[PDB]
Amino acid sequence: YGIATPKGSSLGTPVNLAVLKLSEQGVLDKLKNKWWYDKGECGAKDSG
Amino acid sequence: RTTAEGVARVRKSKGKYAYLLESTMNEYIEQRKPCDTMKVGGNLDSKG
Protein backbone atom coordinates (compact mmCIF):
# COMPACT_ATOMS: atom_id res chain seq x y z
CA TYR A 1 0.00 0.00 0.00
CA GLY A 2 1.43 3.33 -1.06
CA ILE A 3 0.63 6.99 -0.70
CA ALA A 4 0.21 8.18 -4.28
CA THR A 5 0.74 11.61 -5.83
CA PRO A 6 0.08 12.63 -9.45
CA LYS A 7 2.83 12.57 -12.03
CA GLY A 8 5.37 15.37 -11.84
CA SER A 9 4.07 17.09 -8.73
CA SER A 10 5.96 18.93 -6.02
CA LEU A 11 4.73 16.66 -3.21
CA GLY A 12 6.31 13.50 -4.61
CA THR A 13 9.62 13.87 -2.80
CA PRO A 14 8.57 15.27 0.65
CA VAL A 15 5.91 12.57 1.08
CA ASN A 16 8.46 9.92 0.08
CA LEU A 17 10.79 11.12 2.83
CA ALA A 18 7.86 11.26 5.25
CA VAL A 19 6.80 7.61 4.97
CA LEU A 20 10.32 6.29 5.47
CA LYS A 21 10.78 8.58 8.47
CA LEU A 22 7.49 7.35 9.94
CA SER A 23 8.66 3.76 9.44
CA GLU A 24 12.08 4.14 11.07
CA GLN A 25 10.46 5.96 13.99
CA GLY A 26 8.03 3.04 14.29
CA VAL A 27 4.98 5.28 14.07
CA LEU A 28 3.55 3.02 11.38
CA ASP A 29 4.09 0.01 13.64
CA LYS A 30 2.58 1.94 16.55
CA LEU A 31 -0.55 2.72 14.54
CA LYS A 32 -1.04 -0.80 13.15
CA ASN A 33 -0.71 -2.06 16.72
CA LYS A 34 -3.47 0.37 17.72
CA TRP A 35 -6.13 0.31 15.02
CA TRP A 36 -6.32 -3.46 14.66
CA TYR A 37 -5.94 -4.41 18.30
CA ASP A 38 -6.80 -1.58 20.71
CA LYS A 39 -9.97 -0.83 18.79
CA GLY A 40 -10.45 -4.60 18.52
CA GLU A 41 -13.82 -5.95 19.62
CA CYS A 42 -12.04 -9.23 20.28
CA GLY A 43 -10.00 -8.75 23.44
CA ALA A 44 -6.37 -9.94 23.71
CA LYS A 45 -6.65 -12.11 20.63
CA ASP A 46 -2.88 -12.51 20.23
CA SER A 47 -2.63 -13.66 23.84
CA GLY A 48 -5.09 -16.53 23.29
CA ARG B 1 29.86 -9.99 17.22
CA THR B 2 28.45 -10.68 13.74
CA THR B 3 25.71 -12.88 12.24
CA ALA B 4 27.78 -16.08 12.08
CA GLU B 5 28.52 -15.87 15.80
CA GLY B 6 24.82 -15.45 16.46
CA VAL B 7 23.99 -18.61 14.52
CA ALA B 8 26.80 -20.45 16.30
CA ARG B 9 25.36 -19.57 19.70
CA VAL B 10 22.02 -21.10 18.67
CA ARG B 11 23.68 -24.42 17.79
CA LYS B 12 25.70 -24.41 21.00
CA SER B 13 23.29 -23.24 23.72
CA LYS B 14 20.79 -26.02 22.87
CA GLY B 15 17.54 -24.06 22.80
CA LYS B 16 18.46 -21.56 25.51
CA TYR B 17 19.55 -18.82 23.08
CA ALA B 18 17.27 -17.26 20.48
CA TYR B 19 18.80 -14.94 17.89
CA LEU B 20 16.76 -12.09 16.41
CA LEU B 21 17.74 -11.22 12.85
CA GLU B 22 16.40 -10.54 9.37
CA SER B 23 13.72 -12.74 7.83
CA THR B 24 15.79 -13.23 4.69
CA MET B 25 18.65 -14.67 6.75
CA ASN B 26 16.38 -16.65 9.07
CA GLU B 27 15.20 -18.73 6.12
CA TYR B 28 18.54 -19.39 4.43
CA ILE B 29 20.21 -20.59 7.63
CA GLU B 30 17.15 -22.83 8.08
CA GLN B 31 17.70 -24.33 4.61
CA ARG B 32 21.43 -25.07 4.99
CA LYS B 33 23.59 -27.65 6.78
CA PRO B 34 23.67 -28.79 9.59
CA CYS B 35 19.95 -27.79 9.54
CA ASP B 36 19.49 -26.88 13.19
CA THR B 37 17.47 -23.64 13.07
CA MET B 38 13.82 -22.83 12.41
CA LYS B 39 11.73 -19.70 11.90
CA VAL B 40 9.17 -19.07 14.63
CA GLY B 41 6.74 -16.21 15.02
CA GLY B 42 5.71 -13.69 12.45
CA ASN B 43 7.62 -10.80 10.97
CA LEU B 44 7.66 -8.13 13.65
CA ASP B 45 8.34 -4.96 11.65
CA SER B 46 8.51 -4.50 7.90
CA LYS B 47 11.56 -3.46 5.90
CA GLY B 48 12.50 -3.50 2.25
GROMACS .gro file of N, CA and C in nm:
model
  288
    1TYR      N    1   0.084  -0.118   0.000
    1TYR     CA    2   0.000   0.000   0.000
    1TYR      C    3   0.088   0.124   0.000
    2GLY      N    4   0.059   0.217  -0.090
    2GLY     CA    5   0.143   0.333  -0.106
    2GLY      C    6   0.062   0.461  -0.111
    3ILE      N    7   0.118   0.566  -0.052
    3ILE     CA    8   0.063   0.699  -0.070
    3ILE      C    9   0.102   0.748  -0.209
    4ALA      N   10   0.002   0.789  -0.287
    4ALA     CA   11   0.021   0.818  -0.428
    4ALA      C   12  -0.007   0.964  -0.458
    5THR      N   13   0.083   1.024  -0.534
    5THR     CA   14   0.074   1.161  -0.583
    5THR      C   15   0.066   1.157  -0.735
    6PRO      N   16   0.009   1.259  -0.798
    6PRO     CA   17   0.008   1.263  -0.945
    6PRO      C   18   0.147   1.284  -1.004
    7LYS      N   19   0.155   1.260  -1.134
    7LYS     CA   20   0.283   1.257  -1.203
    7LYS      C   21   0.343   1.396  -1.215
    8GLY      N   22   0.467   1.410  -1.171
    8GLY     CA   23   0.537   1.537  -1.184
    8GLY      C   24   0.486   1.645  -1.093
    9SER      N   25   0.452   1.610  -0.969
    9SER     CA   26   0.407   1.709  -0.873
    9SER      C   27   0.518   1.743  -0.775
   10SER      N   28   0.494   1.847  -0.695
   10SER     CA   29   0.596   1.893  -0.602
   10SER      C   30   0.595   1.813  -0.473
   11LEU      N   31   0.485   1.743  -0.445
   11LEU     CA   32   0.473   1.666  -0.321
   11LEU      C   33   0.524   1.524  -0.333
   12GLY      N   34   0.586   1.487  -0.445
   12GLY     CA   35   0.631   1.350  -0.461
   12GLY      C   36   0.749   1.318  -0.372
   13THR      N   37   0.844   1.410  -0.363
   13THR     CA   38   0.962   1.387  -0.280
   13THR      C   39   0.940   1.410  -0.130
   14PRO      N   40   0.870   1.515  -0.081
   14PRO     CA   41   0.857   1.527   0.065
   14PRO      C   42   0.766   1.423   0.129
   15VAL      N   43   0.670   1.367   0.054
   15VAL     CA   44   0.591   1.257   0.108
   15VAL      C   45   0.675   1.130   0.113
   16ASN      N   46   0.763   1.112   0.014
   16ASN     CA   47   0.846   0.992   0.008
   16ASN      C   48   0.950   0.990   0.119
   17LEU      N   49   0.991   1.108   0.167
   17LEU     CA   50   1.079   1.112   0.283
   17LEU      C   51   0.999   1.107   0.413
   18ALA      N   52   0.868   1.129   0.405
   18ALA     CA   53   0.786   1.126   0.525
   18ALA      C   54   0.753   0.984   0.566
   19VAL      N   55   0.721   0.899   0.469
   19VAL     CA   56   0.680   0.761   0.497
   19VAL      C   57   0.796   0.681   0.553
   20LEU      N   58   0.915   0.700   0.497
   20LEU     CA   59   1.032   0.629   0.547
   20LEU      C   60   1.075   0.680   0.684
   21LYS      N   61   1.051   0.808   0.713
   21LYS     CA   62   1.078   0.858   0.847
   21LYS      C   63   0.976   0.803   0.947
   22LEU      N   64   0.851   0.788   0.904
   22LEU     CA   65   0.749   0.735   0.994
   22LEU      C   66   0.762   0.584   1.011
   23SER      N   67   0.843   0.519   0.927
   23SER     CA   68   0.866   0.376   0.944
   23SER      C   69   0.986   0.350   1.034
   24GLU      N   70   1.092   0.431   1.020
   24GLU     CA   71   1.208   0.414   1.107
   24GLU      C   72   1.177   0.459   1.250
   25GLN      N   73   1.088   0.557   1.265
   25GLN     CA   74   1.046   0.596   1.399
   25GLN      C   75   0.944   0.499   1.457
   26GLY      N   76   0.899   0.400   1.380
   26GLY     CA   77   0.803   0.304   1.429
   26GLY      C   78   0.663   0.356   1.447
   27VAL      N   79   0.632   0.473   1.392
   27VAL     CA   80   0.498   0.528   1.407
   27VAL      C   81   0.397   0.449   1.325
   28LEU      N   82   0.442   0.389   1.215
   28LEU     CA   83   0.355   0.302   1.138
   28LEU      C   84   0.329   0.172   1.213
   29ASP      N   85   0.430   0.120   1.283
   29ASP     CA   86   0.409   0.001   1.364
   29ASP      C   87   0.327   0.033   1.488
   30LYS      N   88   0.338   0.155   1.540
   30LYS     CA   89   0.258   0.194   1.655
   30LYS      C   90   0.111   0.206   1.617
   31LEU      N   91   0.084   0.253   1.495
   31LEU     CA   92  -0.055   0.272   1.454
   31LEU      C   93  -0.121   0.139   1.419
   32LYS      N   94  -0.048   0.050   1.352
   32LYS     CA   95  -0.104  -0.080   1.315
   32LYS      C   96  -0.128  -0.164   1.439
   33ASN      N   97  -0.047  -0.142   1.543
   33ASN     CA   98  -0.071  -0.206   1.672
   33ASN      C   99  -0.198  -0.151   1.738
   34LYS      N  100  -0.243  -0.032   1.696
   34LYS     CA  101  -0.347   0.037   1.772
   34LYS      C  102  -0.482   0.028   1.704
   35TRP      N  103  -0.485   0.027   1.571
   35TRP     CA  104  -0.613   0.031   1.502
   35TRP      C  105  -0.669  -0.108   1.479
   36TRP      N  106  -0.583  -0.210   1.478
   36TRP     CA  107  -0.632  -0.346   1.466
   36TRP      C  108  -0.662  -0.407   1.602
   37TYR      N  109  -0.586  -0.368   1.704
   37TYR     CA  110  -0.594  -0.441   1.830
   37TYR      C  111  -0.665  -0.361   1.939
   38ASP      N  112  -0.624  -0.236   1.961
   38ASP     CA  113  -0.680  -0.158   2.071
   38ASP      C  114  -0.822  -0.112   2.041
   39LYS      N  115  -0.856  -0.097   1.914
   39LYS     CA  116  -0.997  -0.083   1.879
   39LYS      C  117  -1.064  -0.218   1.856
   40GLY      N  118  -0.993  -0.328   1.880
   40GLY     CA  119  -1.045  -0.460   1.852
   40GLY      C  120  -1.157  -0.503   1.944
   41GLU      N  121  -1.270  -0.542   1.884
   41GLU     CA  122  -1.382  -0.595   1.962
   41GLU      C  123  -1.344  -0.726   2.030
   42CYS      N  124  -1.264  -0.808   1.963
   42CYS     CA  125  -1.204  -0.923   2.028
   42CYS      C  126  -1.096  -0.872   2.123
   43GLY      N  127  -1.095  -0.924   2.245
   43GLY     CA  128  -1.000  -0.875   2.344
   43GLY      C  129  -0.886  -0.973   2.365
   44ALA      N  130  -0.763  -0.921   2.351
   44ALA     CA  131  -0.637  -0.994   2.371
   44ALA      C  132  -0.629  -1.118   2.283
   45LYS      N  133  -0.650  -1.098   2.153
   45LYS     CA  134  -0.665  -1.211   2.063
   45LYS      C  135  -0.529  -1.274   2.030
   46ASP      N  136  -0.422  -1.194   2.035
   46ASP     CA  137  -0.288  -1.251   2.023
   46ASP      C  138  -0.251  -1.335   2.145
   47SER      N  139  -0.304  -1.299   2.262
   47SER     CA  140  -0.263  -1.366   2.384
   47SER      C  141  -0.336  -1.499   2.402
   48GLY      N  142  -0.434  -1.529   2.317
   48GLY     CA  143  -0.509  -1.653   2.329
   48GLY      C  144  -0.465  -1.764   2.235
   49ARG      N  145   2.903  -1.085   1.805
   49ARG     CA  146   2.986  -0.999   1.722
   49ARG      C  147   2.921  -0.975   1.586
   50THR      N  148   2.904  -1.081   1.506
   50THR     CA  149   2.845  -1.068   1.374
   50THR      C  150   2.737  -1.176   1.365
   51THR      N  151   2.684  -1.198   1.244
   51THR     CA  152   2.571  -1.288   1.224
   51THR      C  153   2.612  -1.434   1.244
   52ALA      N  154   2.733  -1.470   1.199
   52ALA     CA  155   2.778  -1.608   1.208
   52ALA      C  156   2.802  -1.651   1.352
   53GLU      N  157   2.839  -1.556   1.438
   53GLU     CA  158   2.852  -1.587   1.580
   53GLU      C  159   2.716  -1.599   1.647
   54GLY      N  160   2.616  -1.531   1.593
   54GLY     CA  161   2.482  -1.545   1.646
   54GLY      C  162   2.420  -1.679   1.613
   55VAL      N  163   2.445  -1.728   1.491
   55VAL     CA  164   2.399  -1.861   1.452
   55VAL      C  165   2.473  -1.968   1.531
   56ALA      N  166   2.601  -1.945   1.560
   56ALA     CA  167   2.680  -2.045   1.630
   56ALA      C  168   2.642  -2.053   1.778
   57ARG      N  169   2.582  -1.947   1.832
   57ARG     CA  170   2.536  -1.957   1.970
   57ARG      C  171   2.405  -2.035   1.978
   58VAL      N  172   2.327  -2.034   1.870
   58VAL     CA  173   2.202  -2.110   1.867
   58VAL      C  174   2.232  -2.260   1.864
   59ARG      N  175   2.332  -2.300   1.786
   59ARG     CA  176   2.368  -2.442   1.779
   59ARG      C  177   2.430  -2.489   1.909
   60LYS      N  178   2.499  -2.401   1.980
   60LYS     CA  179   2.570  -2.441   2.100
   60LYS      C  180   2.483  -2.441   2.225
   61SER      N  181   2.400  -2.340   2.246
   61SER     CA  182   2.329  -2.324   2.372
   61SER      C  183   2.205  -2.412   2.384
   62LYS      N  184   2.173  -2.490   2.280
   62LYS     CA  185   2.079  -2.602   2.287
   62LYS      C  186   1.937  -2.558   2.323
   63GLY      N  187   1.889  -2.454   2.256
   63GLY     CA  188   1.754  -2.406   2.280
   63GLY      C  189   1.741  -2.304   2.391
   64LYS      N  190   1.851  -2.261   2.451
   64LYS     CA  191   1.846  -2.156   2.551
   64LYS      C  192   1.872  -2.018   2.493
   65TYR      N  193   1.928  -2.010   2.372
   65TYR     CA  194   1.955  -1.882   2.308
   65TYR      C  195   1.877  -1.869   2.178
   66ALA      N  196   1.792  -1.768   2.171
   66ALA     CA  197   1.727  -1.726   2.048
   66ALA      C  198   1.808  -1.612   1.988
   67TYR      N  199   1.803  -1.597   1.857
   67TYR     CA  200   1.880  -1.494   1.789
   67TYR      C  201   1.790  -1.418   1.693
   68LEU      N  202   1.769  -1.290   1.720
   68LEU     CA  203   1.676  -1.209   1.641
   68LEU      C  204   1.753  -1.147   1.525
   69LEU      N  205   1.705  -1.170   1.403
   69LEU     CA  206   1.774  -1.122   1.285
   69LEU      C  207   1.673  -1.106   1.172
   70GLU      N  208   1.724  -1.078   1.052
   70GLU     CA  209   1.640  -1.054   0.937
   70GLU      C  210   1.565  -1.180   0.895
   71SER      N  211   1.452  -1.160   0.827
   71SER     CA  212   1.372  -1.274   0.783
   71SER      C  213   1.428  -1.335   0.656
   72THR      N  214   1.517  -1.264   0.587
   72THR     CA  215   1.579  -1.323   0.469
   72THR      C  216   1.702  -1.405   0.507
   73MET      N  217   1.757  -1.382   0.627
   73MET     CA  218   1.865  -1.467   0.675
   73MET      C  219   1.812  -1.580   0.761
   74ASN      N  220   1.694  -1.562   0.820
   74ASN     CA  221   1.638  -1.665   0.907
   74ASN      C  222   1.586  -1.782   0.825
   75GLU      N  223   1.563  -1.761   0.695
   75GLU     CA  224   1.520  -1.873   0.612
   75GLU      C  225   1.638  -1.946   0.549
   76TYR      N  226   1.744  -1.873   0.512
   76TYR     CA  227   1.854  -1.939   0.443
   76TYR      C  228   1.939  -2.022   0.538
   77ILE      N  229   1.953  -1.977   0.663
   77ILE     CA  230   2.021  -2.059   0.763
   77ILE      C  231   1.938  -2.183   0.796
   78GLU      N  232   1.805  -2.169   0.789
   78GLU     CA  233   1.715  -2.283   0.808
   78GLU      C  234   1.732  -2.387   0.698
   79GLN      N  235   1.761  -2.343   0.575
   79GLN     CA  236   1.770  -2.433   0.461
   79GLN      C  237   1.914  -2.467   0.424
   80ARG      N  238   2.002  -2.483   0.523
   80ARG     CA  239   2.143  -2.507   0.499
   80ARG      C  240   2.198  -2.593   0.612
   81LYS      N  241   2.301  -2.672   0.581
   81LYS     CA  242   2.359  -2.765   0.678
   81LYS      C  243   2.421  -2.690   0.796
   82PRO      N  244   2.422  -2.750   0.917
   82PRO     CA  245   2.367  -2.879   0.959
   82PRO      C  246   2.218  -2.880   0.993
   83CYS      N  247   2.141  -2.783   0.943
   83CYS     CA  248   1.995  -2.779   0.954
   83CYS      C  249   1.946  -2.782   1.098
   84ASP      N  250   1.978  -2.679   1.177
   84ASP     CA  251   1.949  -2.688   1.319
   84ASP      C  252   1.869  -2.567   1.367
   85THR      N  253   1.824  -2.483   1.274
   85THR     CA  254   1.747  -2.364   1.307
   85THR      C  255   1.610  -2.368   1.241
   86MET      N  256   1.513  -2.299   1.302
   86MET     CA  257   1.382  -2.283   1.241
   86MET      C  258   1.339  -2.138   1.255
   87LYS      N  259   1.228  -2.105   1.190
   87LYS     CA  260   1.173  -1.970   1.190
   87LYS      C  261   1.040  -1.972   1.264
   88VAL      N  262   1.037  -1.913   1.382
   88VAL     CA  263   0.917  -1.907   1.463
   88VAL      C  264   0.866  -1.765   1.467
   89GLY      N  265   0.737  -1.751   1.495
   89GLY     CA  266   0.674  -1.621   1.502
   89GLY      C  267   0.651  -1.560   1.365
   90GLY      N  268   0.592  -1.442   1.368
   90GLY     CA  269   0.571  -1.369   1.245
   90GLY      C  270   0.679  -1.266   1.224
   91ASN      N  271   0.672  -1.192   1.114
   91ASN     CA  272   0.762  -1.080   1.097
   91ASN      C  273   0.715  -0.964   1.184
   92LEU      N  274   0.806  -0.911   1.265
   92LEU     CA  275   0.766  -0.813   1.365
   92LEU      C  276   0.743  -0.676   1.303
   93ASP      N  277   0.847  -0.617   1.244
   93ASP     CA  278   0.834  -0.496   1.165
   93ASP      C  279   0.851  -0.530   1.019
   94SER      N  280   0.834  -0.431   0.933
   94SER     CA  281   0.851  -0.450   0.790
   94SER      C  282   0.963  -0.361   0.739
   95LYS      N  283   1.051  -0.419   0.658
   95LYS     CA  284   1.156  -0.346   0.590
   95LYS      C  285   1.150  -0.378   0.442
   96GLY      N  286   1.247  -0.328   0.367
   96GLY     CA  287   1.250  -0.350   0.225
   96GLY      C  288   1.391  -0.352   0.170
   0.00000   0.00000   0.00000
